[PDB]
Amino acid sequence: GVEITEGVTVTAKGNTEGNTADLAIDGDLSTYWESSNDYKWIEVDLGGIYELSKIEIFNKDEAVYKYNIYASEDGENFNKIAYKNNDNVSDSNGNMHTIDNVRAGKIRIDVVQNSNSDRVNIAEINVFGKNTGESLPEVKKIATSNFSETPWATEYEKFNSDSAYANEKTLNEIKNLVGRVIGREFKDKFIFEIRDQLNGNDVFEVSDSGDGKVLIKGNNGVSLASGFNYYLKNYCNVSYNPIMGSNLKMPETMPSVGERVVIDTPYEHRYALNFCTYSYTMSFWDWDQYEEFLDWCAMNGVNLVLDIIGQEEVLRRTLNEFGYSDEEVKEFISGPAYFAWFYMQNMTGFGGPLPNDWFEQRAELGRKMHDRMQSFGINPVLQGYSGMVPRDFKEKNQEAQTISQGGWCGFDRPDMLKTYVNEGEADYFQKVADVFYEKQKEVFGDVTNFYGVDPFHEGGNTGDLDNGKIYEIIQNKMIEHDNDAVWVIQNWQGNPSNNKLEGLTKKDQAMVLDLFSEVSPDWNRLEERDLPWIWNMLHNFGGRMGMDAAPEKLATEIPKALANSEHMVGIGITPEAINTNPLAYELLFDMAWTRDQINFRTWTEDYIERRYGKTNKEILEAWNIILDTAYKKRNDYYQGAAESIINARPGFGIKSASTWGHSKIVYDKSEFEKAIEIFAKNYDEFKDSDAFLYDFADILKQLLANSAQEYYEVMCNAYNNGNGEKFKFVSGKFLELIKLQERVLSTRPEFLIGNWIEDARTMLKDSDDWTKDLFEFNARALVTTWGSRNNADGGGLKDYSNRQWSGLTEDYYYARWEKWINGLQAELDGGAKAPNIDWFKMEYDWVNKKSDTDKLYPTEASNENLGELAKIAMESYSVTNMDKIL
Numbered sequence: 001g002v003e004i005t006e007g008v009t010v011t012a013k014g015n016t017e018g019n020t021a022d023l024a025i026d027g028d029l030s031t032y033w034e035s036s037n038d039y040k041w042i043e044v045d046l047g048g049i050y051e052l053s054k055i056e057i058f059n060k061d062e063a064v065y066k067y068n069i070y071a072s073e074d075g076e077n078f079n080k081i082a083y084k085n086n087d088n089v090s091d092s093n094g095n096m097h098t099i100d101n102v103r104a105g106k107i108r109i110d111v112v113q114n115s116n117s118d119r120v121n122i123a124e125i126n127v128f129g130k131n132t133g134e135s136l137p138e139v140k141k142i143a144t145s146n147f148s149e150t151p152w153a154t155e156y157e158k159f160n161s162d163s164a165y166a167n168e169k170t171l172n173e174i175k176n177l178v179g180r181v182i183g184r185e186f187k188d189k190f191i192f193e194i195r196d197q198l199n200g201n202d203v204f205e206v207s208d209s210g211d212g213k214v215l216i217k218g219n220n221g222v223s224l225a226s227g228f229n230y231y232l233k234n235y236c237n238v239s240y241n242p243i244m245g246s247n248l249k250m251p252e253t254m255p256s257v258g259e260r261v262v263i264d265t266p267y268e269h270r271y272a273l274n275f276c277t278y279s280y281t282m283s284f285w286d287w288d289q290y291e292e293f294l295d296w297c298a299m300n301g302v303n304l305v306l307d308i309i310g311q312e313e314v315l316r317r318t319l320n321e322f323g324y325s326d327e328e329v330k331e332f333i334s335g336p337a338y339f340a341w342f343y344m345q346n347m348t349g350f351g352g353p354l355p356n357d358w359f360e361q362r363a364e365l366g367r368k369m370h371d372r373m374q375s376f377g378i379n380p381v382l383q384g385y386s387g388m389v390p391r392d393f394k395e396k397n398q399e400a401q402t403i404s405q406g407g408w409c410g411f412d413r414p415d416m417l418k419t420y421v422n423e424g425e426a427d428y429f430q431k432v433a434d435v436f437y438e439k440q441k442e443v444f445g446d447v448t449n450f451y452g453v454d455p456f457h458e459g460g461n462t463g464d465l466d467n468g469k470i471y472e473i474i475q476n477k478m479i480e481h482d483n484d485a486v487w488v489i490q491n492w493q494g495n496p497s498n499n500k501l502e503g504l505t506k507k508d509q510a511m512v513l514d515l516f517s518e519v520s521p522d523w524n525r526l527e528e529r530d531l532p533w534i535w536n537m538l539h540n541f542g543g544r545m546g547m548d549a550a551p552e553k554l555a556t557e558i559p560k561a562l563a564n565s566e567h568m569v570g571i572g573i574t575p576e577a578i579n580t581n582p583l584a585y586e587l588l589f590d591m592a593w594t595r596d597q598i599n600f601r602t603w604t605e606d607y608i609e610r611r612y613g614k615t616n617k618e619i620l621e622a623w624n625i626i627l628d629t630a631y632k633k634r635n636d637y638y639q640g641a642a643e644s645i646i647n648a649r650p651g652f653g654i655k656s657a658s659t660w661g662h663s664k665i666v667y668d669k670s671e672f673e674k675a676i677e678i679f680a681k682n683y684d685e686f687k688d689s690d691a692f693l694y695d696f697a698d699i700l701k702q703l704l705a706n707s708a709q710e711y712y713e714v715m716c717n718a719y720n721n722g723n724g725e726k727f728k729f730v731s732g733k734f735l736e737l738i739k740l741q742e743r744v745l746s747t748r749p750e751f752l753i754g755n756w757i758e759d760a761r762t763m764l765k766d767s768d769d770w771t772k773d774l775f776e777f778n779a780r781a782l783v784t785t786w787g788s789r790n791n792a793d794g795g796g797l798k799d800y801s802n803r804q805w806s807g808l809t810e811d812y813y814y815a816r817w818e819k820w821i822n823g824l825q826a827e828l829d830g831g832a833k834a835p836n837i838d839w840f841k842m843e844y845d846w847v848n849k850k851s852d853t854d855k856l857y858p859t860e861a862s863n864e865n866l867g868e869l870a871k872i873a874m875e876s877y878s879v880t881n882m883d884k885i886l
């Protein structure tokens with residue numbers, strides 16, 4: 001007491017008809033707010049700041065509800081003050097929660113679960129407390145600096161206008177890179193020099209200084225870093241991969257180069273990054289992780305990188321000019337785990353709203369990246385504009401002409417402005433495009449000539465418009481704001497069509513990324529139309545894990561394409577995530593520095609020695625087995641690594657964990673298991689190499705994925721035959737297999753769900769609890785249900801980004817299999833026929849849990865012995881001994 005019965009108002013961001021937000025606070029138990037969408041929270045203003053003692057919640061029925069309650073005394077920070085997570089039914093008495101005299105002017109109530117419906121509701125909410133006499137402040141409006149006003153602009157222009165300064169900056173940065181990669185104590189062992197290009201091509205040199213130091217020349221920062229990398233790999237037996245295992249143990253004495261080497265590349269561009277990489281991998285990266293990535297990029301010859309960092313600020317400034325408040329902009333933009341599909345015009349809103357602090361922090365991060373990219377000579381690919389607008393754009397701008405784009409995986413696509421209109425009509429494409437390109441300038445300045453945009457990506461609608469004309473006008477608009485503009489276009493599943501592409505009047509100022517060149521190349525159509533294009537290895541889909549690579553194709557098809565083309569302007573990587581199969585990515589970028597086919601087998605032999613720091617005949621034998629099995633050339637169509645049955649929704653006839661995935665293992669499982677045996681035999685000798693431990697975990701989890709598929713078959717067979725005792729035994733072994741898998745996965749920091757989640761929760765500084773919880777939602781949802789019900793199920797996205805991760809395996813994958821198996825067992829045992837399980841309901845329950853109230857996942861890997869774990873797998877849990885195991 002006392003109850004707050006005067007002056008209290010409420011908002012919501014969605015409701016079903018009739019069931020408006022104000023109905024949560026009208027004193028009437030028979031009327032309710034109800035949610036219409038993925039915003040399932042209301043915000044209550046109390047008409048002043050009160051020290052709260054009690055909050056009372058009534059629901060419309062007797063379902064089981066779960067919810068989190070947040071309070072704010074400053075109007076900005078919403079911190080968690082109470083929650084319901086127990087399985088108690090709601091009833092006519094309501095739920096009463098004690099707060100401990102927390103000051104609050106506003107309250108948020110996020111109802112994350114209703115056992116009866118996808119929709120949530122609040123019939124009534126009563127707030128009790130003592131008036132402080134005070135009122136909330138305003139919220140000051142979102143304010144960001146203009147680039148030209150920042151120290152970043154001064155530095156960018158100085159580098160541009162002063163050669164001596166630029167060279168000193170670059171050379172010093174490359175020295176800083178050496179210190180970060182191998183240690184500060186190695187900086188003075190290298191001398192770096194700028195030189196010119198070799199016959200119009202990027203080039204490096206490595207040689208002896210004459211006094212025991214290493215002289216490295218390069219035409220720019222990336223050539224220099226590539227020379228450093230060449231030295232480490234070829235002379236020091238050192239291998240740098242900050243994401244997927246390194247060997248950084250330097251020799252006692254700096255090895256001599258001997259004969260000087262001069263190495264060039266025939267490719268103008270070496271490209272990195274899918275839009276998807278920004279979501280499946282990079283969602284919650286800090287500057288430390290970005291810096292590491294750029295160092296790896298430069299060392300691997302990368303000079304062209306997709307860049308969407310801080311684009312939310314560009315969009316904010318743009319839409320502010322066409323009748324959108326900052327709050328409406330926040331509702332349009334997705335959450336931090338979904339920018340890939342927001343910028344590809346596939347989805348809106350889901351995962352948001354982003355916090356007010358987001359905009360300045362990301363614009364700063366983007367500026368910081370561009371400074372480092374300038375130093376190295378890496379070209380970012382910024383954004384183009386093709387007509388993307390919110391669905392309410394016409395409501396706010398009545399003369400605008402738009403085309404509804406329909407749905408993508410159950411998400412509402414944003415609208416698209418008609419690229420051209422009739423005489424007499426207002427041309428808002430021209431209006432918004434002009435503003436977009438000018439706002440992008442204001443935020444980041446003139447940092448690139450490369451701009452990426454992709455209308456009609458995985459659907460949409462061209463309406464009444466001419467396809468060729470659409471692409472003509474988009475390109476023309478782009479060139480208008482930058483005369484040297486190059487429109488970077490994705491080639492995905494035969495789109496854009498030839499005659500979209502024939503619409504480009506300036507062929508030399510487009511560049512097409514052939515997205516999937518190592519499995520489904522589609523550059524012939526581009527070469528035929530004199531379109532500059534890049535050969536890309538996609539390789540990774542959704543961050544899904546498993547032993548999978550196409551080394552032979554990379555070693556052969558790339559120089560073959562160069563020899564058989566005139567418009568191949570680069571090679572690159574387009575992975576949906578960067579988390580898997582390091583061999584593939586290293587070989588890909590090595591292929592930039594040759595015009596000839598190489599031997600993928602002897603390449604691998606050299607690769608593993610520098611990756612582990614040592615090699616022997618047996619380790620070589622194990623890797624040849626991998627080359628003969630999991631990494632063997634194939635000629636079919638497939639999307640990513642063969643999926644683990646452990647990660648699939650339980651069921652009969654399972655052929656995949658994800659809708660567009662596959663579970664078929666196209667190589668002999670028992671042959672592959674020999675690699676694990678050899679690794680186990682050599683464990684104690686190689687255990688001081690982290691990259692060896694990484695690879696051992698990779699192949700062993702693959703062994704267990706492979707054998708689980710066989711055990712799953714047997715157990716389904718035992719069901720179908722009515723054999724209760726056999727099903728119990730085989731399903732028991734199947735569950736024990738998953739438990740062993742969890743132990744294997746626990747050995748790697750990169751396989752911990754706790755790191756993914758903690759990164760999300762800590763990615764900004766001075767976040768409130770609201771933002772941390774919402775970002776955790778983004779992290780949990782992306783790797784499981786992806787979206788809500790209509791996206792996971794009807795939309796086909798369920799388990800699209802499934803991960804063979806610790807914590808996730810035990811609490812999510814294992815839990816699903818356990819439930820289904822008890823159900824079948826209960827039936828076999830003279831039971832209750834087994835229920836249909838509403839899988840999404842169970843999955844989302846896990847999605848919505850919070851690290852500070854439910855269960856905190858560890859950020860620390862285990863000490864388990866992979867050699868000993870391999871032994872158990874071979875003995876108990878393998879295809880090889882499966883007949884003796886049963």
Ligand SMILES: CC(=O)N[C@@H]1[C@@H](O)[C@H](O)[C@@H](CO)O[C@H]1O
Nearest residue numbers: 274276341492515541542576800
């Ligand atoms: C759900 C998902 O990630 N879909 C991606 C899509 O966003 C991307 O444009 C494309 C090409 O890389 O491939 C799909 O697999």
Ligand SMILES: [Ca+2]
Nearest residue numbers: 023028031123
């Ligand atoms: Ca009511």
